[PDB]
Design a binder for these strands. Structure first.
Lengths: 161, 161, 161, 161, 161, 161, 161
DNA sequence: TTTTTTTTT
DNA sequence: TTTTTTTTT
DNA sequence: TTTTTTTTT
DNA sequence: TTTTTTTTT
DNA sequence: TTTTTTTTT
DNA sequence: TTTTTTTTT
DNA sequence: TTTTTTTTT
DNA sequence: TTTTTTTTT
DNA sequence: TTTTTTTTT
């Protein structure tokens, strides 16, 4: 059964949520099990409409791979990273939509800015949601993501009894 | 005529406002003018009741003297100060109410916490309002307070024509 | 009466101008005066068409709040800031136009780049004007903005006689 | 006769190519020769469609001037530069298309990211090709560009016999 | 009309007061105005007789020139200055009275000592009043003196409307 | 009416004086006011003829723009600047007279040398007046110039009531 | 045949151009070739008359020897050089005209100022053209001059086939 | 007497 | 509502 | 003999 | 127009 | 007993 | 809705 | 396809 | 044209 | 009571 227990941060202009998507497995004829579709850590961004209210209709998604998760948890206070995703990569609609996720430290050292940029060349849209994340909040993510990393890789299937 | 143009900061648990109170002068018989009651920079604190709404009924006040203003504008990024006021000093009700205003830097260096503590021994109350103030916001105060300092001292009366 | 005395910087690809917009006050029935609409420091950008000539028709505006002004005047040589504005915030047309103003130091240390980016999702436009600002020019702004800060806050109404 | 000997770098999401465009000269009536159209170092970017295959149809160009070449070859390991070009500068169609070329070091120090951004306000397109360039690859460019610089300036015409 | 709004510091053995003396102007026949007698910042010292009471009869004065004011406001935490005045300079009674004003930091760094020495060779007197001035108090002076400097120079007459 | 309240420094070989020239405004038909001719800070130099007497007949002038003023007030102890002016710039007599104003620190750190050089190719003259300026004196200028900067820009017209 | 492919920099008050002058050779009777008149790198300066227009009539020239070229290309970011030339050296008109070429870094480190001073004691003229040169522009010169150095020395005649 | 010029209301 | 008080004109 | 391959003219 | 000059083949 | 609240499935 | 793909059992 | 333009021979 | 909003007199 | 003085309009 589905599970919905997102870690969410709500700020001035936008909201950020993160939750794991487990890998899917295929039961081999040989009897064993073979990992099929890889797990990710899914990030959802959406804007604040009005006052302390948020427009879930206008959300944008970004799926962190295991490797991108490893990059986030291994970041220093002063480090920054940027990932670039094509939702329709290798499909017919490649090149049309372009997503970039950036994690930059703020000048104070009091945390990071996490922003998703989405440029759609089909719909002629250019969205950008930015969310400030404290040292404490990013500590929660690093710890939660670290906990989740072995699961999205499916290594939690390697358990004694 | 009265003027109400406060600089205010609204945060999670409380609001902070600041505005100058000009000095009062007494017109000498000799003809000149003599400064009477000294100006201050008045600070008002009040708590947030409910969500992004604030209880003006529960406000507490603290009046910065010229000297206390000079201490605020001359503070370094890393410095902190604390002032201790008795509203009814030298009156019959002295010792009953005790106010302390503290300005402490936050660990990040991203600003300060400005808190007013009010201990009333008559009403058996103990209030405390704390407000986080960014580097930018405190820059506004230092600049606005510096502008205001000569006025609360009444030195703006020393003007050529 | 209206006053037009902008401080302007004209460079290769664009022009930058800055001038204060005073606060508006409402005359209370009580007799006093209450600050209504807040002052800003208005920034105007516009591109250079042809040679040393500029297209005023294509100007874009950005209004610095008191707090954003405090952030500009308190910047170090090596510091950078970025502000993000929605012209139609909280109105029906929110989310449609998105403005970002960035102040970044140049590598030499000889000043800053001040750029306004405007992304309009209604008109499908994406404008960007950048202006190089020397140490001397930014010194003029910091001094002029500092002078103006108490006025846009309306604290120049707190004057003895 | 035309010569096609580009130095090219092929990476995950895009390809980068560079080659010199010689200056054109006009034979004076006086007898001598006068440099007419200036040489450049032409950069071509294009995206990877499918797997290790690239869509030459979707290429974007950027022409480095002598001065921009001088800026590239004089860059330190830790330095970064950004150039901003209007293809139709001073023509009727100015302002419509806007190209920015950035060279930023990567965090490791193992090279640079070289990206071309193209914003077209006529066709409502927003393209961005980024290519990672190792220390060795950028060494090739600096050396090749340095070799080429005197030629695109036409100084290779000043030769004894 | 005369204005009396001194900034005063009261300490153990003596009191210190400071206030601006505006410049006097002469109305030219040509129509304009010509600055006549220069402004100063007047310092008054007087001793404490008895307990927390001060002998205004025994006061001594020292008039800071614009230049001496500039020296005070530009002092570092660790700096010290000394000024030497002859009240009857260039008059018949020159050499008779000799005043020296010293500003020395205290060992702690918690401020300065400001002392006036007056040696009168006519009356055979040798007075010395010293006043401890905190960092906050000297911050008030620097800010108040800086505000006043343009006025004692008469530059506040150069105003648009 | 005209105002003459210069800040002047008199030294061994020459005298230096500085005073603001306000901007001139044009009353729009629209009703408002438009800044016309820009303000400056005017510097006058003249030589000492005889002993402690100065030849006002031989004075030379130099007009600091707002930007040049910003450069002076933002100078470090160790910094130096040089400005180059053509009095008859863009007029028929351009190129004939050439003025250079230099501010260099002296070796001791006890101030600056401020010199005006005037080379006139019409009259075949080459004048040079140098004036030593202490830390205190230059503090007066920085403070006075900073006070004056908003006025020569005409920003003192942006005042609430 | 003559070749005209100068590298030129156009700035506010003056223009700077540089191009190589090859050495002249004398064909020995012995059969070989003997270098006669030495090559230089010729610098031309000329002033800007009007707006972004330059007075080629008023140009002044300065010829860099091989050794002076070696000094320019071996300069550090922080270094400065000055060369002093007599156009009519050893001729009858020696001493009459005096040219000095200076290369000084600007305070920011963003490049250099390159100025030619020409003092003519026959015509009683004193010219001075200064041109700001960025790091990139001076990189072009160093690279172009380095390329040209062997040619002005005539070492490009030592070639295998 | 003064380095100018670029965009409005 | 506000920490006061000390010295004149 | 040589590490190849990816995009044109 | 250009700082020259010093030693050969 | 516990600081809440903001967006779905 | 989600950047894919490469090697088995 | 390419950011231009300013001064000669 | 301009990022708003929160508390009085 | 106050350190002055030097150059105009």
């Amino acid at each position: 059964g589905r599970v919905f227990a997102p870690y969410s941060v709500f700020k001035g202009k936008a909201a950020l949520s993160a939750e794991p998507r487990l890998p899917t497995f295929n039961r081999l004829d040989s009897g064993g099990v073979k990992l099929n579709r890889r797990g990710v850590i899914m990030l959802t961004f959406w804007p604040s409409v009005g006052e302390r209210k948020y427009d879930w209709e206008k959300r944008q998604l970004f799926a962190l791979s295991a490797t991108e998760v490893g990059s986030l948890i291994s970041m220093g206070t002063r480090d920054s990273s940027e990932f670039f995703h094509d939702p329709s990569m290798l499909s017919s609609n490649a090149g049309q939509v372009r997503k970039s996720l950036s994690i930059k430290p703020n000048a104070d050292g009091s945390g990071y800015f996490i922003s998703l940029s989405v440029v759609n060349n089909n719909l002629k849209t250019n969205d950008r949601f930015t969310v400030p994340v404290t040292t404490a909040e990013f500590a929660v993510m690093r710890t939660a993501f670290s906990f989740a990393l072995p699961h999205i890789m499916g290594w939690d299937r390697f358990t004694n009894r």
